[PDB]
């Protein structure tokens, strides 16, 4: 939909500007994208919060130094996915290793994170 744009080089990753959200479909492909946007760190705007914003469910650490996390999220219409967030966050439960994630999301994350030097 027009609410977001598919990230270049990804079949299951998109970004919603008005929401400032990067999302990765758990098991689903994107389709119909006539446009794509190059990934860039600015997209992961650091969320400011005097007390760390609490998070629930499955949480994974991407960059502890940069307060980057991956949060399991299901769209109310029951669409599984993960949200990549950067900011002052804390986890209600124990943080989980990324290896737990499926190869699909893992490949997308590698593409999005490792700079193409």
């Amino acid at each position: 939909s027009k609410d977001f744009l598919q990230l270049k080089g990804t079949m299951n990753a998109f970004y919603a500007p008005k929401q400032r959200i990067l999302s990765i479909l758990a098991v689903n492909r994107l389709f119909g994208a006539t446009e794509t946007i190059d990934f860039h760190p600015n997209l992961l705007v650091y969320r400011q919060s005097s007390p760390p914003v609490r998070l629930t469910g499955d949480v994974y650490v991407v960059d502890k130094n940069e307060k980057v996390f991956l949060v399991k999220h299901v769209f109310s219409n029951t669409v599984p996915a993960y949200l990549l967030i950067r900011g002052d966050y804390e986890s209600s439960s124990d943080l989980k290793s990324l290896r737990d994630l499926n190869p699909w999301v893992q490949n997308t994350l590698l593409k999005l994170l490792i700079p193409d030097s």
Binding site: Q48, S49, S50, D88
Partner: protein, 275 residues
């Protein structure tokens, strides 16, 4: 300005080593303590405190008391506060502390063999006779003077194991207290508050249950039974920048402390003795 800061009479006899001695000012207080607050905290996990008893007009009985610095998860050695002479060497990592501090501890526990061993080892320091022996003399004399001062036998009805309901039999915590040195006994008296205070047939109860435990291992910040008491505790950075400029706040707070409450103090016909 007598500095009673035992464990600050430590001199880094090694030239390459400099002892900061960053310890608490209260050592210059002519109190019943022979060890000031920071030494107490560091080496016994205790924080000095005072417990007023009668504070109405001028009767100002202010019994002293220290606080646990032990959480509700530590156990065994981690929980022991004042180890016995049989286990203090193990509880304290003497090897990790300066030999002068080790000497102080050995004197406190009457480990003369360890004292002799330490001075024998110091015998083989490069500047041994020049200044190592002078340091030995200074530290040893200071510690011995403090110990003699503490010891009452030199030139009252406080029972520490007599509070423990549900104990099978025996007490003997007072036995070990007797076995302790004068300095250790005075420290225990100064820091531990008897749960009961009887004056001329007048009993005051401060707690419904004692907080400390005394056994062969020594003084332990353990409970008489059940689980342990809950005991919680610029270089401008990017994170230090705060965001946009923009719940019982109105009520006072009861401390989440665990003061040393254990024992029964009996006072004879003597009245409210305030000297």
């Amino acid at each position: 300005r007598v500095n009673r800061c035992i464990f600050a009479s430590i001199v880094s006899f090694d030239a390459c080593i400099t002892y900061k001695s960053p310890c608490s000012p209260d050592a210059y207080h002519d109190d019943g303590w022979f060890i000031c607050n920071n030494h107490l905290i560091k080496r016994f996990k205790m924080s000095k405190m005072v417990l007023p008893i009668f504070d109405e007009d001028d009767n100002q009985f202010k019994m002293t008391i220290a606080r646990h610095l032990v959480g509700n998860k530590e156990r065994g050695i981690k929980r022991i506060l004042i180890p016995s002479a049989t286990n203090y060497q193990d509880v304290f990592n003497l090897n990790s502390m300066m030999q002068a501090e080790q000497l102080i501890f050995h004197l406190i526990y009457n480990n003369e063999n360890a004292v002799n061993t330490i001075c024998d080892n110091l015998k083989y320091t490069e500047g041994f006779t020049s200044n190592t022996q002078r340091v030995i003399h200074s530290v040893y004399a200071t510690t011995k003077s403090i110990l003699d001062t503490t010891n009452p036998n030199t030139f009252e009805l406080r029972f520490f194991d007599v509070t423990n309901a549900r104990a099978l039999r025996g007490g003997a915590g007072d036995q070990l207290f007797n076995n302790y040195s004068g300095f250790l006994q005075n420290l225990i008296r100064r820091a531990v508050a008897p749960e009961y205070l009887q004056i001329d047939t007048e009993e005051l109860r401060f707690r419904n249950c004692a907080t400390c435990i005394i056994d062969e291992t020594g003084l332990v910040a353990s409970v008489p039974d059940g689980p342990e008491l809950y005991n919680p505790i610029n270089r401008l950075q990017i994170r230090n920048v705060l965001k946009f400029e923009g719940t019982l706040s109105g009520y006072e707070e009861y401390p989440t402390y665990v003061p040393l409450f254990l024992g029964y103090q009996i006072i004879n016909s003597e009245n409210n003795f305030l000297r």
